Design a protein around this nucleic acid. Structure first.
Ligand SMILES: [Mg+2]
Ligand SMILES: [Mg+2]
Ligand SMILES: [Zn+2]
Ligand SMILES: [Zn+2]
Lengths: 926, 72, 132, 125
RNA sequence: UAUAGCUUCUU
RNA sequence: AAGAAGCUAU
């Protein structure tokens, strides 16, 4: 009636309009962070216990302000008033009103919260950490209501996309000040609770978007002066949103005011430690864990990750010219130098070298290599650069001219094309077509390719979940051994590779491996465990067949980096490639029955199994720095008895300064790499696998923790979810007895086959449909909120029939064929790829088939499994290659019999145009 | 009839490149764009129009004797 | 024995490869024109014949309907064959003449050009036109 | 043959040592010992970021302009200010390395140049 | 850069 | 098993 609306509207001059129906309660669907001894998770639940009224400003226009009235009991109605009376004076506490009303014959207590927002902070966090492009109405409403955009901004399809439409970042950055004010009010509420004693747990859903706190139903009194808030779940779940919305942008202005000019720092300032401490004490004051601005002071890698996560956020408010090598003037025999004696990482702090020699008598070979390898001397004597073609930071130009490197087209092998056409190939309407060519590039291709690092953005992670994820991921690499080897035990192949800049001006890796002794190499390696050695990476365009224009570049890191990384990682990398039957299948061959073995190992003993595979858009450019640091730390846990804490930290710093934020040379100019992976490193394919497994485990954690715990029939999975939430957000230490259990649960219901950024999963269909294991949507949301990319579901496949094998893995398809008596799985390529490799070549001497007959033998080895395809047009490629090999030999014999007067008495070359030499390559026992 | 066009376009761009056409940045950019468009095409009409546009580049120069090479 | 046979095979391979890259330009041009002849396209054949006898373009032939095209005419016979009044036929399209200038850069009007009066101007004209 | 291979390696070690040591000494002579010294003498400790060495001590600047719109707002005229300093133009070349003139850089004649343009200026005192 | 496979020669 | 060379695919 019009009496409840008159009592709820107390003396406040408010005009209310009912949202429900009279005194009937209003049911809503909102996100909650629940842990109450029976359910645990960050999921969406039905909330029907309060009546909600809206307030109109004036005339007949509704505003964003609600009067939520709750009705629970009588005992709680006194507890929540006793706590409110103590917290009423705080400015971050939503105004409460208490009154008694009669529904029919009873006096029902009511609690009214005045001028609340429609949504809370939990809704904002859930909408962005569980993004679905088809159902994102809550995010749209939040964006529109707070003047981030207009309702028409969503008519532009692909608005959510990060790679396409990068204006979504600017749209999201319109909530930064709201989030910052929410954090400030959270700190105020924490201080108020600490005063007089209100010990309790702070939750995201108990704070509206204005930053006001309104729920005190689980608090308890204590002696005034000693009250402890619990802010683990709150901050940890809110962490990923603080960099997406750029909350701390206002910290770079004069008085923290967005209307004033940016603060101007001394160009020579690089420490920034007091500022970091002040920021931490201002925004995260009750976070109960020591924070080290410089990670050189950390206790272990589990602390390094924790502190680097905070540094990632805090370093976005400092000038970009204060990061990089720190140089100083030394004197070599009296002539001044300029060398790097430190480094300022955005994640690791202000690492300082320990072996700086200010005065030197001579210059040895090791010192010569170290000095003519860092960018200090090259940049100090270069010219200022203002490259306007890219948004990346530019350091200096090392010449007086800009180099514009192009790529030439392919070389047509006309004889093979005519031979194929004469045998009914490339006819109109055929299923075999030319799709792979040699594409050409102009002079702007190099810089256009380099400017794709704009997809790398500062990403903050959920540390309390990332730590558990790393502990679970480390179990996938237990069946390996690693450590440090000596210069003798380094097995380096292809000694004629590039040596990087500037070492490519005098020789290849051979010239530097032959020049240095074993003692010199050991001394250089031991130097890198006490000092940081910045290096320079050179970018070049590559000449290879492809199906898209998509100019491709190859990075060559300097010899001073690879030579020392080998002695650190070779044992582990060679042990990973010698293991069969493991999750990581690097080093496992597909010949002699390897493909069948791998497929039957991934299948394992899953129940109701399906097959799934996903994609990583812009994997090498968009990968956050935190995940790369995590992978590097995980690969370095093998050095538990050969290195100390300081040695391991300095090796990690060298890795970060050499392959993560190195200075890249492109067209005779020096730039700054923001992040991502470089193809020139030997550990790229092994860190990619760690990153892939970490993402796959995060997907499963998110799938299991975002499920309604009251609808889980199985009593084991429910307790698994409960204890997973506990181990994440309520237990600050490693629980091996649960890490083992979660690893076993994932291995029984989620089997993976990982090769760098390529994976195939055989999972339990029923569990995935019940939300107990990961699906494609979970991967989409995880990539959206932890990788700054949108993963289209059109690039992911699924296969319900396990007898048809994965749709695609390593650019190969699977067919269950009959060999001998049993059935085996065989991989076959795209016929267009083989035909294009045969028709277009990258050298004028490879177009004369007589001098190159092993090219076609190797191409026919790969094309054999096409002979068992149901399609007869696919199966003709093998026979065409055999016929071409036969004709090539026939022509070569005559050519050699005419150019000379001799012929080979015995050749033993008839094995190559018969279908046994190639059929024996896919049969086991060899 | 499209594979023939793509192969002839590849050979034409090779001839242009070995004729020192990349010394001019804009002409090389146009030739590269046409050659890459031909390869990715799907209908013969646009491929042939691009092919004639790209052959006009070689016809406009004077470094390749046309009558002599048209001796059948 | 086999030492000698394998030595000869290596010697033959080196001789061939060193000769394959010593004749790249002529072979590439021959292959290109063989494939162009085999393609048998009216649009390409027209421009090829014109370039063979009298007509060579001065810039990339546009594909749009507004871009300007400039051509070179060596004498009057090519003008008769390709030019018929105010319309220009080139590369299997219709072009409307807009401005003609003789070889000395002096503008010339269409009506002036005829047979007898041909030997009165710098013949290598430059005709410009636009697509229909 | 082991001795001969070792002699080759021992010869190349000294050959590359001279190249590395000759490069380092050549760069010593391109360093402004009186301008780069000023900033180092001001640092509280002696260490400065490497990114501000060319910014505050370089004597020549090179600008790469993608189009005319960027040229208008960056290097218009003869003297322009960048990095809180005044630079005076010295030469302008295009992507083909030919010399371009400031008069030819117009909004109507713009579509006639190899547009990647490198503008080199000298710091003005 | 790393992985796998094929062919040839020497010990 | 050691190597020296060539090639193919991921
Ligand atoms: Mg609540
Ligand atoms: Mg694939
Ligand atoms: Zn720490
Ligand atoms: Zn170690």
């Amino acid at each position: 009636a019009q009496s409840f609306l008159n009592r709820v509207c107390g003396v406040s001059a408010a005009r209310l309009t009912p949202c429900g129906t009279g005194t009937s309660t209003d049911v809503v669907y909102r996100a909650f962070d629940i842990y109450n001894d029976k359910v645990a998770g960050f999921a969406k639940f039905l909330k029907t216990n309060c009546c909600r009224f809206q307030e109109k400003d004036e005339d007949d226009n509704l505003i964003d302000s609600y009067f939520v009235v709750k009705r629970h009991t009588f005992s709680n109605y006194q507890h929540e008033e006793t706590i409110y009376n103590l917290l009423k004076d705080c400015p971050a506490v939503a105004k409460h009103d208490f009154f008694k009303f009669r529904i029919d014959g009873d006096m029902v207590p009511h609690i009214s919260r005045q001028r609340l927002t429609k949504y809370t902070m939990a809704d904002l966090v859930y909408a962005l950490r569980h993004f679905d492009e088809g159902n994102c109405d809550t995010l749209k409403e939040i964006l529109v209501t707070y003047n981030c955009c207009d309702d028409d901004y969503f008519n532009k399809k692909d608005w959510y996309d990060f790679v396409e439409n990068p204006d979504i970042l600017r749209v999201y950055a319109n909530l930064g000040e709201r989030v910052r004010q929410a954090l400030l009010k959270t700190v105020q509420f924490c201080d108020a609770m600490r005063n007089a004693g209100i010990v309790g747990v702070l939750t995201l859903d108990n704070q509206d978007l204005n930053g006001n706190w309104y729920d005190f139903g689980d608090f308890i009194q204590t002696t005034p002066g000693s009250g402890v808030p619990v802010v683990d779940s709150y901050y940890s779940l809110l962490m990923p949103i603080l960099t997406l919305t750029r909350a701390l942008t206002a910290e770079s202005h004069v008085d923290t005011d967005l209307t004033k000019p940016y603060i101007k720092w001394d160009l020579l300032k690089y420490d920034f430690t007091e500022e970091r401490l002040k920021l931490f004490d201002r925004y995260f004051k009750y976070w109960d864990q020591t924070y080290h601005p410089n990670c050189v002071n950390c206790l272990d890698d589990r602390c390094i990750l924790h502190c680097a996560n905070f540094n990632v956020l805090f370093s976005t408010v400092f000038p970009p010219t204060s990061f990089g090598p720190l140089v100083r003037k030394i004197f070599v025999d009296g002539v001044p130098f300029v060398v790097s004696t430190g480094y300022h990482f955005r994640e690791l702090g202000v690492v300082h070298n320990q072996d700086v020699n200010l005065h030197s008598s001579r210059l040895s070979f090791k010192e010569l290599l170290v000095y003519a390898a860092d960018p200090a001397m090259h940049a100090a004597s270069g010219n200022l650069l203002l490259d306007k073609r890219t948004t990346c930071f530019s350091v200096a130009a090392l010449t007086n001219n800009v180099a514009f490197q192009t790529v030439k087209p392919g070389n047509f092998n006309k004889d093979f094309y005519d031979f194929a056409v004469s045998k009914g190939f490339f006819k109109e309407g055929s299923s075999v077509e030319l799709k792979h060519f040699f594409f050409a590039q102009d002079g702007n291709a190099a810089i256009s390719d380099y400017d794709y690092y704009r997809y790398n953005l500062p990403t903050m992670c959920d540390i309390r979940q990332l730590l558990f994820v790393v502990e679970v991921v480390d179990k996938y690499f237990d069946c390996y051994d690693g450590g440090c080897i000596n210069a003798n035990q380094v097995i380096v192949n292809n000694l004629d590779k590039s040596a990087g800049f500037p070492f490519n001006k005098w020789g290849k890796a051979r010239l530097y491996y032959d020049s240095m002794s074993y003692e010199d190499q050991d001394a250089l390696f031991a130097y890198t465990k006490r000092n940081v050695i910045p290096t320079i990476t050179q970018m070049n365009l590559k000449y290879a067949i492809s199906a898209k224009n998509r100019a491709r570049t190859v990075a060559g890191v300097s010899i001073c980096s690879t030579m020392t990384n080998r002695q650190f990682h070779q044992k582990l990398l060679k042990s990973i490639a010698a293991t069969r039957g493991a999750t990581v299948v690097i080093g496992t061959s597909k010949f002699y029955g390897g493909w069948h073995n791998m497929l039957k190992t991934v299948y394992s003993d899953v129940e109701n199994p399906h097959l799934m595979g996903w994609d990583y858009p812009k994997c090498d450019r968009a990968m956050p720095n935190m995940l790369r640091i995590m992978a590097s730390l995980v690969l370095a846990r093998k050095h538990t008895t050969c290195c100390s804490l300081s040695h391991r930290f300095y090796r990690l710093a060298n890795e970060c300064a050499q392959v993560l934020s190195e200075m890249v040379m492109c067209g005779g100019s020096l730039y700054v790499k923001p992040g991502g992976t470089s193809s020139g490193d030997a550990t790229t394919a092994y860190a990619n696998s760690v990153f892939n497994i970490c993402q796959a485990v995060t997907a499963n954690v998110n799938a299991l923790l975002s499920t309604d715990g009251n609808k889980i029939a199985d009593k084991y999975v429910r307790n698994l979810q409960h204890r997973l939430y506990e181990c994440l957000y309520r237990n600050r230490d490693v629980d091996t007895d649960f890490v083992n259990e979660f690893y076993a649960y994932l291995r029984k219901h989620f089997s993976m086959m990982i090769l760098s950024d390529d994976a195939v999963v055989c999972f339990n269909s029923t569990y995935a449909s019940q939300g107990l294991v990961a699906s494609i949507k979970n991967f989409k949301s995880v990539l959206y909120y932890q990788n700054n990319v949108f993963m289209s579901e059109a690039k992911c496949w699924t296969e319900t029939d396990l007898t048809k094998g994965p749709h695609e893995f390593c650019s190969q398809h699977t067919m269950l064929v009959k060999q001998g008596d049993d059935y085996v799985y065989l991989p076959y390529p795209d016929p267009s790829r083989i035909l294009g490799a045969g028709c277009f070549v990258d050298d004028i001497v490879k177009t004369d088939g007589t001098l190159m007959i092993e090219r076609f033998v190797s191409l026919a080895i790969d094309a054999y499994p096409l002979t068992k395809h149901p399609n007869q047009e696919y199966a003709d490629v093998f026979h065409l290659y055999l016929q071409y090999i036969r004709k090539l030999h026939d022509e070569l014999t005559g050519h050699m019999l005419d150019m000379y007067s001799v012929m080979l008495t015995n050749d033993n070359t008839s094995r190559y145009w018969e279908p046994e030499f190639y059929e024996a390559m896919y049969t086991p026992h060899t | 009839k499209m594979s023939d066009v793509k192969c002839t376009s590849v050979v034409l761009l090779s001839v242009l490149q070995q004729l020192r056409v990349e010394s001019s940045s804009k002409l090389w950019a146009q030739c590269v764009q046409l050659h890459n468009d031909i390869l990715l095409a799907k209908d013969t009409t646009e491929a042939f129009e691009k092919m004639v546009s790209l052959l006009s580049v070689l016809l406009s120069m004077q470094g390749a004797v046309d009558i002599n090479k048209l001796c059948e | 024995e086999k030492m000698a046979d394998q030595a000869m095979t290596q010697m033959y391979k080196q001789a061939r490869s060193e000769d394959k890259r010593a004749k790249v330009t002529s072979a590439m041009q021959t292959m290109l024109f063989t494939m162009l002849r085999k393609l048998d396209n009216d649009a390409l054949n027209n421009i090829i014949n014109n370039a063979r006898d009298g007509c060579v373009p001065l810039n990339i032939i546009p594909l749009t309907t507004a871009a300007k095209l400039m051509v070179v005419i060596p004498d009057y016979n090519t003008y008769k064959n390709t030019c018929d009044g105010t319309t220009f036929t080139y590369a299997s399209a219709l072009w409307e003449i807009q401005q003609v200038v003789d070889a000395d850069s002096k503008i010339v009007q269409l009506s002036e050009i005829s047979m007898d009066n041909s030997p009165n101007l710098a013949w290598p004209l430059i005709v410009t036109a636009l697509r229909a």
